[PDB]
Design a protein around this ligand. Structure first.
Ligand SMILES: [Zn+2]
Length: 121
């Protein structure tokens, strides 16, 4: 047995679990995309749908972490939302990447005339 390699070192890394499942992902983007492929669920749609504000978005995340509902439900929701609680604001998990994700980026100023003219065809 010439080959002799034994090591149990640790590398400081960050990982964020999934909302629906318990899958870890190096970064947030990874998860979101994963859900859009498997759970066929988009997080961006929510922010725009329930106009989740800076804090709102946070509640939406933790909400799934605590409640742990199903995609089907995610689509079938109404006001008051099941995440309209402060308690949710708190990070259900530790060093939650998703929570860090800049939701603002999602907000796009519809000022530029970019392809301005719906139903042009
Ligand atoms: Zn998942």
């Amino acid at each position: 047995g010439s080959s002799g390699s034994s090591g149990e070192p640790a590398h400081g890394r960050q990982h964020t679990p999934c909302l629906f499942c318990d899958r870890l992902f190096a970064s947030a983007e990874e998860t979101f995309s994963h859900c859009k492929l498997e759970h066929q669920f988009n997080i961006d749609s929510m922010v725009h749908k329930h106009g989740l504000e800076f804090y709102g978005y946070i509640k939406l995340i933790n909400f799934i972490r605590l409640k742990n509902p199903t995609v089907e439900y995610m689509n079938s929701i109404y006001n008051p939302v099941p995440w309209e609680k402060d308690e949710y604001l708190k990070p259900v998990l530790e060093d939650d990447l998703l929570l860090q994700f800049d939701v603002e980026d999602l907000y796009e100023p519809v000022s530029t005339p970019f392809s301005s003219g719906p139903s042009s065809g």
